[PDB]
Structure formats: structure tokens, C-alpha cells
Amino acid sequence: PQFEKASMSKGEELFTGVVPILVELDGDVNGHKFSVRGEGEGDATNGKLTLKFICTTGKLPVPWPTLVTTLVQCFSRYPDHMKRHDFFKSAMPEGYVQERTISFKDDGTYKTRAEVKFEGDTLVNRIELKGIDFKEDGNILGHKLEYNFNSHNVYITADKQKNGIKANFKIRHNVEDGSVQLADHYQQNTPIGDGPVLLPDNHYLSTQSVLSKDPNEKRDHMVLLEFVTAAGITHGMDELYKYRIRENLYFQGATSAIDIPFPGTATGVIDEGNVLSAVTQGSVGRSLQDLSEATGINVHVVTLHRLDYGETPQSFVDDLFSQWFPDPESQANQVIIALDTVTNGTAIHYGDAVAERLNPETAESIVQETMRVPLREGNYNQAVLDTVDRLGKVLKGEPDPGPP
Amino acid sequence: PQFEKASMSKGEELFTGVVPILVELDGDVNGHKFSVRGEGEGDATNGKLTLKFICTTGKLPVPWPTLVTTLVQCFSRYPDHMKRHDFFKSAMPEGYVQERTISFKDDGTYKTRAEVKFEGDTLVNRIELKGIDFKEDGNILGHKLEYNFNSHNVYITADKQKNGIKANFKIRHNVEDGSVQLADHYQQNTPIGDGPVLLPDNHYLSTQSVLSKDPNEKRDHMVLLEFVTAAGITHGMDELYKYRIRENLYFQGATSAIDIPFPGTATGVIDEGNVLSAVTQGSVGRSLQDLSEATGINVHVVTLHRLDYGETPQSFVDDLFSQWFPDPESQANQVIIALDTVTNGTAIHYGDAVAERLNPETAESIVQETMRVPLREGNYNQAVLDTVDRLGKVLKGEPDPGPP
Numbered sequence: 001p002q003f004e005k006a007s008m009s010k011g012e013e014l015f016t017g018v019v020p021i022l023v024e025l026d027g028d029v030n031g032h033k034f035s036v037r038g039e040g041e042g043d044a045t046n047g048k049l050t051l052k053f054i055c056t057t058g059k060l061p062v063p064w065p066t067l068v069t070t071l072v073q074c075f076s077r078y079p080d081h082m083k084r085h086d087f088f089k090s091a092m093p094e095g096y097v098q099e100r101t102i103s104f105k106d107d108g109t110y111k112t113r114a115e116v117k118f119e120g121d122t123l124v125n126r127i128e129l130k131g132i133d134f135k136e137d138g139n140i141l142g143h144k145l146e147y148n149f150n151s152h153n154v155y156i157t158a159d160k161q162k163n164g165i166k167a168n169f170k171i172r173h174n175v176e177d178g179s180v181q182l183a184d185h186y187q188q189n190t191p192i193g194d195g196p197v198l199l200p201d202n203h204y205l206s207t208q209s210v211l212s213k214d215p216n217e218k219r220d221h222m223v224l225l226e227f228v229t230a231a232g233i234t235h236g237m238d239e240l241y242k243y244r245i246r247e248n249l250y251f252q253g254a255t256s257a258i259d260i261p262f263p264g265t266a267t268g269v270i271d272e273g274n275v276l277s278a279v280t281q282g283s284v285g286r287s288l289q290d291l292s293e294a295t296g297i298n299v300h301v302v303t304l305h306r307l308d309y310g311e312t313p314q315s316f317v318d319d320l321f322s323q324w325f326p327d328p329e330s331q332a333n334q335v336i337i338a339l340d341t342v343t344n345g346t347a348i349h350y351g352d353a354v355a356e357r358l359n360p361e362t363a364e365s366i367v368q369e370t371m372r373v374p375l376r377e378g379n380y381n382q383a384v385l386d387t388v389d390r391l392g393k394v395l396k397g398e399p400d401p402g403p404p
Numbered sequence: 405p406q407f408e409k410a411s412m413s414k415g416e417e418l419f420t421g422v423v424p425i426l427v428e429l430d431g432d433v434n435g436h437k438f439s440v441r442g443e444g445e446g447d448a449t450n451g452k453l454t455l456k457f458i459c460t461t462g463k464l465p466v467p468w469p470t471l472v473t474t475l476v477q478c479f480s481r482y483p484d485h486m487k488r489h490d491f492f493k494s495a496m497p498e499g500y501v502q503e504r505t506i507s508f509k510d511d512g513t514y515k516t517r518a519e520v521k522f523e524g525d526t527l528v529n530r531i532e533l534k535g536i537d538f539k540e541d542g543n544i545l546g547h548k549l550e551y552n553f554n555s556h557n558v559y560i561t562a563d564k565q566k567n568g569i570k571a572n573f574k575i576r577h578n579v580e581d582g583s584v585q586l587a588d589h590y591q592q593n594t595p596i597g598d599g600p601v602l603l604p605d606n607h608y609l610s611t612q613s614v615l616s617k618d619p620n621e622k623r624d625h626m627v628l629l630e631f632v633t634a635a636g637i638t639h640g641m642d643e644l645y646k647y648r649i650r651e652n653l654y655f656q657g658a659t660s661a662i663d664i665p666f667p668g669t670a671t672g673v674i675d676e677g678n679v680l681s682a683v684t685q686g687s688v689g690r691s692l693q694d695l696s697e698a699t700g701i702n703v704h705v706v707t708l709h710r711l712d713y714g715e716t717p718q719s720f721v722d723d724l725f726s727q728w729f730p731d732p733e734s735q736a737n738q739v740i741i742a743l744d745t746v747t748n749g750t751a752i753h754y755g756d757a758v759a760e761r762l763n764p765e766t767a768e769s770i771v772q773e774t775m776r777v778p779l780r781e782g783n784y785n786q787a788v789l790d791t792v793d794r795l796g797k798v799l800k801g802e803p804d805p806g807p808p
Contacts, residue, residue, distance in 0.1 A: 045554075077555055150449075151633075206610075233485055239407075
């Protein structure tokens with residue numbers, strides 16, 4: 001079996017071999033202050049990672065395993081069929097901001113902000129950690145955690161408004177008395193630069209960590225080794241799918257036009273890519289209804305997650321319109337605007353009655369300029385409202401306003 | 405997110421913690437004879453594995469990395485949503501026979517047979533290896549391979565006839581001159597005992613190996629550490645799906661009745677679970693056609709991979725018959741027999757005209773005894789032919805023969 005061997009981003013090629021790694025952390029938990037420095041290497045092709053951390057201020061005031069997740073997901077092994085979903089490498093060399101909240105069950109919580117970026121040939125992770133309201137003799141400050149680490153799944157989803165991702169997972173820390181201490185993780189990454197990045201389908205990383213000690217070393221330290229790979233889960237893999245309906249977990253795949261059936265409505269908005277607020281849809285709804293009752297032109301606005309490979313925005317919107325409005329009579333009385341929320345590609349289609357009021361060069365200007373300019377900052381709500389505002393005045397037969 | 409935490413086989417519960425491990429290998433390559441013994445532990449919940457191998461006969465005549473794949477896939481981490489596909493643990497404690505052929509590109513080939521089974525509380529892998537026609541100064545016998553190891557995917561499929569699995573993968577061995585030496589792997593596993601086992605959907609294991617040396621050790625040896633997890637890939641995850649049609653790679657999922665459209669044929673066989681030879685289908689074809697032309701009863705035989713969760717063999721065959729033959733007139737002139745090839749569950753449905761010749765207690769005997777008895781040994785061809793033979797004589801109006 002052979003898959004897409006080609007490079008999917010420029011950043012991906014920086015990790016082609018072994019990349020040196022540096023980690024720096026300034027922490028404060030309940031006021032006990034500390035610092036950690038770490039160095040090692042990473043081999044992203046194989047998903048291998050090797051680091052040695054040391055506490056530069058004495059002995060760690062918290063247990064080492066509690067800092068593992070804080071102390072470079074760009075070194076994950078994305079198999080060939082998953083390469084299009086590797087956000088982390090696509091943000092390089094500029095890097096990303098990785099922020100987290102870590103709630104230890106029945107105990108305090110960490111608050112973390114790091115920058116992960118290339119400085120020369122080395123990948124650098126620079127962290128600030130703050131820990132609040134921990135129990136004086138709890139599992140954390142009391143150092144009751146075992147020096148070992150379990151494997152986990154990190155569930156990832158795209159944050160399209162921020163041109164980044166979000167992730168959630170539960171870390172299980174073995175307690176020396178046989179119990180288990182839970183650390184719920186909420187995470188957000190956002191690229192430092194303005195270059196383009198890969199916005200992923202829902203997927204997960206399966207993680208493994210092996211903690212050890214350096215016999216020669218006498219400072220307080222941790223030796224860590226890791227393997228990491230990405231994978232996806234679709235609804236058909238989940239025996240429990242039928243029952244957990246009463247999201248952000250399943251690999252969406254591409255949207256083909258047939259996947260969107262005609263809504264059965266004169267006008268409206270179809271937010272399949274889930275980028276629009278209910279308040280926005282309510283406003284767009286009233287506007288398109290205004291246009292209909294006055295001009296008798298019916299518009300639908302369709303968002304979607306991403307398009308099939310090989311199919312373009314124009315080709316999707318052309319197919320959809322044929323499917324919705326088979327009869328040429330059902331045509332012309334109808335419009336459709338489409339938006340790919342992963343790529344921000346847009347396109348329109350309309351029947352001749354509309355073109356009896358809408359010129360090509362204008363119609364392009366409305367989807368390629370008025371609509372796309374706000375997507376430059378991830379403002380999908382404004383992109384749709386502006387487009388609705390400009391087009392509606394055209395179809396009401398008014399002075400066309402300008403593009404941005 | 406929460407998935408099926410429950411146990412899917414009895415064998416699965418033997419790996420609940422850390423299991424001690426023992427490996428024994430007797431090898432002969434081009435006549436250079438050797439033995440290796442290894443001991444360590446495995447933690448299948450986390451997909452971790454730790455072993456130390458030593459050559460008991462001097463220095464290894466071949467490079468250590470070339471024996472990694474030969475020297476316990478039961479220690480793989482199956483995530484919760486994949487537990488139904490873990491063949492390896494379900495064959496325990498009796499175990500399985502793991503046989504392989506390893507073709508080193510432009511060089512010789514290994515031939516291997518092992519038994520993996522529990523002896524007391526320890527998992528034991530006992531291997532015989534034979535190597536044939538290697539190059540005297542090749543990459544193998546010449547010891548030109550680097551002491552390191554890449555990550556790989558092991559692609560797995562069910563071998564239903566043998567109540568086991570098959571797997572294929574390509575191992576890439578780094579060569580000290582910068583080139584890469586390929587070792588194509590063909591594999592077959594079969595349970596040692598007669599107890600029930602899990603037959604899996606297509607899936608893969610993503611593997612990682614870290615090779616190291618023991619400083620205190622002076623014998624020829626290898627220290628190995630491993631992480632391993634299972635995952636699946638459906639067609640929608642593969643950008644190249646549309647082009648590689650002109651198999652055994654994609655996670656099949658369950659078959660619902662709607663997935664099988666009415667074939668458009670008076671009679672025939674539909675081998676959706678892909679267990680029947682063309683020669684068998686040709687024979688069944690002529691028989692069912694004989695029954696039709698003579699008695700005017702039309703039979704279809706349908707196999708399928710496995711059923712949706714919650715749906716039974718009877719419930720699938722009842723739905724299918726309604727879907728194929730809506731009109732009660734299209735009924736009675738028609739029969740349908742269904743077979744789940746993963747579970748060997750069977751069921752029939754027929755219209756009243758058939759029951760004007762076919763008694764319930766008999767119809768059951770034909771699908772629950774005549775058809776299932778040959779499935780006990782994985783003989784799907786004989787199961788269908790026997791059932792066709794017995795039923796056809798009933799519907800021709802002849803002395804019913806017996807069940808097994």
C-alpha cells in the first residue's frame with residue numbers, strides 16, 4: 001500500500017531528520033518558584049523524542065510527572081494518509097502559541113503559556129507556568145505520585161476563527177497508594193506568524209512516555225523518552241455512535257454536494273462547516289427573507305467543512321445548484337453562495353433572472369473580495385454579513401457599493 | 405469522550421498489568437547456526453515493551469536489527485474503540501502460531517515459525533528461523549546495517565478460513581552508506597486452541613522500536629524498547645482512494661441491509677463477506693437456477709462481513725427481504741439466506757408459497773445445523789453447498805435428508 005508521499009506544507013520539511021530541542025520553563029505554584037531547563041533531540045519521521053530535564057533552582061516543588069505535558073507536538077509522526085492534518089509543523093518556522101489549563105481533580109490547577117518556534121536549527125519550547133490553590137498535603141505538593149507515565153489519546157479539532165486548533169484530554173497519574181489522580185487538559189494553539197497553516201479534520205494523537213533517571217546525574221532531573229503518532233476515528237469505528245447523539249470527535253472527511261440535500265426552504269443559511277453564530281444566522285435569515293419578499297429572488301448561503309479532493313468551489317456550487325433546482329423553472333428564482341471554511345475558497349451561482357440584475361465582474365467581486373477579505377482574520381460572521389449586505393443592495397437594484 | 409471500556413474477550417484480561425516475557429530462537433542462515441534468548445516485561449494497557457536479548461552461541465552471524473520483527477503483538481495497545489479487533493489477546497492463553505516470510509530486497513529470505521502462548525504467568529515466544537541464499541558480502545552477512553530502527557505500519561486483515569489473520573508490511577533498514585535495505589514481510593497467524601477468537605476488521609499497528617546496548621554486558625546482545633498502538637483507516641481518510649480502484653486496506657465497518665441493493669437477478673449468490681470461491685459461486689449459481697426453472701422458487705444466498713451492533717442475523721435477513729421485495733406479489737416467489745462471516749450466525753426468510761413446501765423446524769435445521777456445522781472449521785464453501793443441496797431437495801419436494 002502506498003499513500004501521499006508528497007510534502008503538504010513548507011514547515012513539514014524542516015523536520016525531515018533529527019532536530020535538536022531546547023525547553024525552558026519558569027514556574028510558580030502556590031508561590032513556590034522554580035525553573036527547569038531541558039535539552040535533547042527529536043525525530044518526527046519516526047515520532048521519537050528524547051530529552052533530559054533538570055531543575056535549575058534546587059528540587060522541584062511539584063512531582064516531575066505533573067509537568068510532562070507542559071514540557072512539542074510538532075514531533076508527532078503523522079502517517080502518510082494524515083499529512084494534511086499536521087497543523088503543528090505547518091506553523092513553523094515562525095511557530096505557535098500553546099496555552100493550556102490543567103485541572104487536577106480535587107486539587108489545584110495549572111495555567112500555562114508557551115511559544116514553540118525555530119531559533120536557528122533547533123526547536124525551542126519556552127514556557128511560563130502558574131499553579132493556583134493546591135492542597136498543602138495533597139497528591140501534588142505532597143509528592144504522592146509515582147515516577148511513571150501512562151499512554152493517552154490527545155483529541156484535536158480545528159479552531160477556524162483563530163486559524164489554529166484546540167485539544168482536550170485526561171491525564172491519569174498513578175498514585176503510590178494505588179489510586180489515580182486525574183488532570184483534565186484544555187488546550188489552544190495559534191500560529192505566531194501570518195503565513196498559511198493546515199487546519200485539520202478531527203483526529204487524535206496516541207502518546208507514550210517513558211520516564212527514567214540518569215545514574216551520573218545528581219541534580220533534581222527527569223529523563224524522558226516518547227513515541228507519538230496521529231490517527232483518526234470515523235463514526236463507523238465507534239460501537240457507541242448510535243447512543244451518544246442525545247461533538248468534535250469524528251474525522252469529518254470531505255463534503256460532496258450530494259451530502260447537502262435541498263433544505264426545503266425558500267431562503268436561508270446552511271452552516272455545515274459550523275463557523276456562524278446563531279445570532280448571525282438569524283440576521284442573515286431576516287435579510288434574505290427581506291430580499292425574497294421584495295425582489296422575489298431567493299438566496300441560500302452554504303458553509304461546509306472542506307471539499308473533496310479534485311473538486312473546486314465553483315464545481316461544488318455548480319453541482320449543488322443542479323441538485324437542488326433540477327427544473328430550469330426552479331432556477332433563476334434562486335441563488336446559492338458557497339464557502340469552504342478550511343481553505344476560505346468561495347463561489348456563487350445564479351439563474352439568468354438574477355443576471356438580469358447581476359453582472360459577472362460584480363458577482364465575482366462580491367465572493368472573491370467582499371466575502372474573502374474578512375476571512376483573512378477568521379471572521380466568518382462578518383464575511384457573510386458583508387456579502388449579504390453588498391449583494392442585497394445590488395439585487396434590490398441600488399447603487400453597488402465597493403469592495404474593500 | 406468515553407468508549408467501550410468493557411472486556412471483549414477472556415484472553416484480554418490476562419494482559420491487565422505487566423506480564424513477564426520470554427523469547428527463545430533457534431536460527432540457521434546459509435548454515436551459520438545460532439541461538440538467542442531474551443527476557444523482559446510487557447504492559448499492554450500502555451503498549452509498552454521492554455526486552456534484553458543475548459546471543460547464546462557467540463556473536464550473531466546476522467545484524468541484530470534484522471531479527472527485531474521475529475523476536476509478541478499481543479502487547480499492542482488497542483484503544484477502546486478498537487477492542488473488538490484484538491485477535492492476538494483473544495487467542496490466549498492457548499496462544500497462536502505466527503509464521504512469516506521475510507524477503508530482503510536483492511538478497512536472501514528468512515522463513516520463520518513461532519508459537520506465542522502463556523506458560524504460567526509469563527508470555528512465551530518460541531521461534532524457529534531459517535535463512536536461505538543470502539549474499540556472502542551482502543548487507544546482511546556483511547554487517548553493513550546501522551544499529552537503529554524506524555517506525556512502521558503493520559497492515560492486518562482477517563483470514564476467516566483459518567480463524568486467524570494475515571499481515572503485510574515493509575521494514576526499512578538504514579544502511580551505513582546512506583542507502584536503505586528493504587525487508588518485505590508476509591505473515592500469517594492461527595490460534596493454537598479451538599476456543600473462540602476475535603476476527604478483525606482491516607486495521608494497522610503503528611510500531612516504534614528503540615535499540616540500545618547494556619554497558620555492563622559483554623556478550624553479543626540487543627536491548628530493545630517498544631511502543632505499539634492499533635488504529636484504522638476508512639476510505640474517506642485516503643486522498644488517493646479515488647485513484648487506486650483500477651484491497652484489504654480499509655476498515656470495513658458493519659454491513660446494514662440497505663448496503664446490499666437488490667441484485668436485479670432471479671437467483672444468485674452475493675459474496676459480500678468475500679469467503680466463497682468463484683468455482684463455488686458458479687456451482688451454487690447453476691443449482692439455484694435449476695431450482696427456479698423447475699420449481700419456480702428463486703433463492704438468493706448473501707454473505708457479508710459483519711452485522712451492525714444491535715442487529716441480529718434474523719433481523720438483517722428480515723429487513724433485506726422487505727427492501728428487495730416490497731410488493732407482497734414479489735414475495736413467496738423468493739427466498740434469501742444470510743450469513744455473517746465474522747460470527748458465523750445465519751438466518752433465512754421466505755414467502756408463504758415456500759412455506760407451502762418448507763416447515764419451520766426444518767428451515768431452522770437447514771441454517772442452524774447443516775450450514776453452521778462446516779463453519780466450525782472455516783469451510784464457507786462447503787457450508788453453502790451443503791445448505792443448497794439439502795434445501796433444494798426439500799423445495800423440489802423430495803425426502804428431506806438429515807442434518808449432520
